[PDB]
DNA sequence: TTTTTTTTTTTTTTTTT
């Protein structure tokens, strides 16, 4: 009276691919109600969801969720196209750089930073990128005792608040080049972080490592060599976002299709 | 077995719009009594009510109950228009601002602050609007530990007590500008907030942020540009309020039928 | 197995209007001991009592089950009128004020404050009134920063002894004129005190406010404008009172049988 | 099912001489093992004992179950007569005083205080009184935060050592005066102490009131008009006392037989 | 069958000389095997042993294990007699004092403080006297946070190292003077104490009181007027002692056979 | 079914060398779905895996898995061989030292301290060795309360970052050299550590002991006497990894085949 | 039901001499997994382990493990002869002293101490003696707050470090001197140690007693004239230790079969 | 046919400190 129920729940979770609570809430609430009525023991469903998430992360990496199964159709049918056109950035070169940074094959280069206002198509694009990947780590400096937290076995590490802290410079340097390092999470819990691309959204400077109560500038060369900086100037307009999933999938497919040459230096010569 | 019963209970809770035990006892009390008699474990009904509320907050909006299916076909039939012409404000402009702040037709601008003593009738209108929306929250800024405690998955955010706190200004600005944000809630909870229309009612100026024990003024530019400020000079009569749901529905219908353009401004003009 | 028992208990609690376990223990004993022997958890009885209290307070009021249909059949059949005449107060004016306080509709005026001897035959009357009505909030000075704690969901509120504090003055000011305001309570919790008619018994200067460690007289004009002062001087005999439900019902009936105009004012002039 | 067992247990606790854990263990020893074997849950027996104690303390006074139906025949039959002769008290006068103090007919003169060493025989009398009635309150002033700890819902209270503070003098004045009032007990809670007759046995002056950090005796007129003081002089002999129960019942019956006039003051006429 | 099994277990624990778990397993071993074969939860045997111990402590007392079963009438039949003769004490007077202190015929005086080395027979004799009785208390003054530990109704209260703390001296005085008292136990436990004979075995002056972190002699007069003094100025030979049950039985028999007079004062006045 | 399923799970854990949950998930993935479809009870599988891990840690060691099963084939063409040849380290001497430190043949010399930059290649080799073996401890120094982590019974104890502490220097010395000491974990329980080969990797000065809140070098003689210090300064190229289990097995087999008389000494000499 | 399982567990624990879960898993792991799969409750196993420990400690001592069960007739051949020749003491005299200390026939003389540098054959012999007997206490001085914590009802008290404290001097005197005494350990816990053999492993200032917050030698005589003290100088080699059980058994048999004269004195002559 | 409760494992604290 429990084996078949657990099997059906695991099958439904694998067929739907749930990652949180509101998702399954707006999806199909009949299975959840049936499970709650049959037994309030949420341990089984929690373990099943954890196993499903682990299998999806360790197997379905970032590119696995980037290559759209449908045809690319056209690149002009996405808001990112006109956004970059108004901002002024190379589409093919930017797509190639993003692919190289997400594939982790570049080596010590695995981090992108943006400098400019948030109204220039930054917050919307960051939210769209975070919502695209099903497993993403939203790291925030809400707890100074442990900065890095939700970012173990994920796909994209979002940095929308503050900058890189100085108390965990080793972890940041290891993640910049796709490496790993044992970092502490909550109270008594040291775990290793796997190679996961990081994207910044905060309107600050990634090089400005916050230490104690000021900024430190001692390892600017490695931070610049392991991170690609994109300057922002010309702001956007009104209602210049609303990035969906089909547009991102088509953009990723187009980027994977045509690939150009990419360098491996800080001073990126954007001239594709 | 219990799956059908749980599905029926969820459907009933969704169609009844229950928000707590009081509403459940007022509406259908037989189901609650039967569930309590069959088993004291209120975990099932609690989870069902939570899921129903989350679904209603993520799907239900304003036209579901704020806009009536049939308009009033007149103007001299509801005390709302009487109180409006007594206070002295633009009817079409006010309706447009209300529809833009509730239905969300722009983005940043998504807040309203109507100041008025306990005699101009604004308090009665605010209480009626709060009672209309069952899934609303009276986020009272009295407790200096967790202010935002009634704005997560709600219909309206009533601000009738207290001004603003300087400790959490980012979350307030994000809620005013229609977007998500993280608030330092409990020790093991801090999710985002869904874009919910916020209406102010306290006589104290909400723009004056309260920091610990002092008042700030530099943080007034965004608080003023992300909302519409209105003032009520003339009072009312002998108990003129207690607006019901039919009156609000008729007013919303009349607005949707007759609405001009919407302007982006903070200081209300002397017209209307 | 227990649905019938739960429904019977709920019906009995709604009929007898029981609010505490002591009342039910004193009244029905067969069903009580039967439920105790059956279910070893008081969750059912607690839920039944909560539902009964909600239906009696939120939906119902007090005079509905307080104004007995059996008139007094004469001018004065007890000693309440004799005590009132010995104290020195307006007859028709006092009756009108009492009817307005019981019904609540004569503007914001809905509170009485007594002052005089510490035993002017009022303690026994207050105790009898509290014992008769099933819903009564006894405001005690147990808490330091949160003195007001027995005013949410109640028919009448009684102020024992001690001067009003300054930590929660807005709640009292709102309850005086029927308004409401959300204030904090224990540790990490804020609620809105439901407006309820309040009566003060402490002869001390209740108009004064205890602010931290001083006596402020600022909150005096609104308190006097929203309340009626009763200056007590001449006391009664030895425990002159013994008010019962029948006496209160007869008084309410004889007062409703003859209603006159009301003179809203703070100073209750004894002469004329 | 368990209704019959619960009814039998209640009847036993009522008319079997069971009031505490030790008393119940000494009464029916096999009943405890039988109840433990029939059910491993002591909640039923705990609730039964609580209900029995409440019914015996609240509604049930004390003399009704401590006044034998047979006279004392001759006053020279117990050690109480010798103690009274050695101390100095009028037979009929003391009997009438005790009757009035136990019946609470004076309205406010329901208090007794003794001013004499422990060697006079006060300790033995207090021990006999405590052993007689099964229930009794024991107020210990060892902790200022919890003055009245053992006296809620009782018939006779015994003041061991220590004096009464000045933080809750109103509670003591209402208890000794034949009234009631909320009193702060443990867990920052407020309990109710009905007019329970109290008797003091310590040798220290009980008139001293500890207010904050001083000793004041302002409460003199009420303490004299609501209590009766008795000064002791002569002591007793080595190994004397050990008052039983039948002797107390016979003495109470003899006192009830001869009832005369009782004065109204603090210093009772020490004569006869 | 539960009641019959409980009664059989109680009878076995009573007629097998069982105190709890240690002695229960020492005397018999098949009881646990039978219990495991019948049931599994040790709560049954725990409650059985608790009830057996409570009954043994209530009914029987000290004399239950003092007088032997077979008369002997001889002073050279035990080692305690030779020890007391070598130390310099009258055998008849010592036996009379022991017989008078065992039954507690004096009342006020029921304690004797012994101060002397261990080679003369102090710690060994104390441990033998403590183990002679099945239920005994060990109020070892080792933790300032725990005044009286094991001593809730016992036959003999053995005191080893440590002195009474200036905070619960009244409880010790009442226990020594044949009376009860309430002493705080653990964080959530506190029971009274029954008048049980107490014997000290401190190597120093036990009359001293431990006040906070110093020594004070405030309660020395009561301890001197209610307790005798014993000094061990001599020393016995090596390889001696062993106070079995037959020795104590013969000693008590000889004491009861030879009864004289006992004096009451500070020092030990061996006059009889 | 329960016993058979538990036995099958234990056998699978012993065969596949399961240690954690994610490992078994990635390994025998069909077993998880089979157990979910058969029943719902993760406690059984958790206990089985815990018992299997405990057995493997208490019975197995390092040489049980370090020994290969076929010829080493490569002698100096592999990546590790090329790195060792370019670093100027003795191949045979290094292999003999590793065999003596892992196989426990040295006994008194079972500690290695690698000092130098991070790009030398020691960090990557240590991480690969830790990830290859199943059970392994990560004794880090992130908190000042838990000096050790999961080192109790393991194959290799990797010291990523941090330095030795002072509150428990005996435990660290016993874990490194191979002594004994009863370590005390939290305030609940504790346990010792089994002689497991420890390998250090932190580039910081490991000899710097953290005493309270300062740096002390008093506990350096034990390390100098029972530990070889190797200065790893010669950096490598740019991410030179690609380490498998077959290569490590071949290297261990070649080392075992080429073993002579290892020279014991703190500072590394020119014997290469 | 569980009678057969309990009997089987008791028989296995008595046969294999199991003293904990580790020993049970090492001797017979099949029954452990069988019981874990056929029953989740551990009450039966806990009771069996407690009974085994009681039977092995209470009804045992030191000499019980002296004369081995297998004759070997070994004298000078194992590492014991080498350690004796390196320490500089008479083998026959040392064996006789060890036998006398294990049998406890010298009254106060019941302890052995051996001073030396560090790894001078003392730690090896200490660890061998600790691992020989399956039941013993490891009174580690890692927590000076509770020294004598794990040694109650044991066979050998191992002292691998720390020094002698003044807070538990009575227990140490009773153990080394052969007596019994109760001492308070943790919060609400008293332990009584019996005359149990003690073996020291460290070479610290054992004579210096830690009193309050400093060192004192007040117990010079009680700590000197109560045990046999010896001095060492010549150390050993590397990997030349780890005394097994066969050598210890042979030495014990040789000492039991070869007994000479033992002089009662602390300052033992250098060379028996 | 016939039930329908074996303990359904009815669900569990606050603690573990």
Curated annotation (Swiss-Prot), chains A, B, C, D, E, F, G:
GO terms for cellular component: host cell nucleus. It comes from Adeno-associated virus 2 (isolate Srivastava/1982) (AAV-2). It catalyses: ATP + H2O = ADP + phosphate + H(+). The keyword Signal does not apply. One of its GO terms (biological process) is symbiont entry into host cell via permeabilization of host membrane. Plays an essential role in the initiation of viral DNA synthesis. Binds specifically to an inverted terminal repeat element (ITR) on the 3' and 5' ends of the viral DNA, where it cleaves a site specifically to generate a priming site for initiation of the synthesis of a complementary strand. Also plays a role as transcriptional regulator, DNA helicase and as key factor in site-specific integration of the viral genome. Inhibits the host cell cycle G1/S and G2/M transitions. These arrests may provide essential cellular factors for viral DNA replication. Residues 90-245 form the SF3 helicase domain. GO terms for molecular function: ATP binding; ATP hydrolysis activity; DNA binding; endonuclease activity; metal ion binding. Interacts with host TOPORS. Interacts with host KCTD5. Keywords: ATP-binding, Covalent protein-DNA linkage, DNA replication, DNA-binding, Endonuclease, G1/S host cell cycle checkpoint dysregulation by virus, Host G2/M cell cycle arrest by virus, Host nucleus, Host-virus interaction, Hydrolase, Metal-binding, Modulation of host cell cycle by virus, Nuclease, Nucleotide-binding, Viral penetration into host cytoplasm, Viral penetration via permeabilization of host membrane, Virus entry into host cell. ATP binds at residues 116-123. Its cofactor is a divalent metal cation. The chain holds residues 219 to 490 of 536 of the full protein. It is found in: Host nucleus. This is Protein Rep68. Its EC number is 3.6.4.12. The gene is Rep68.
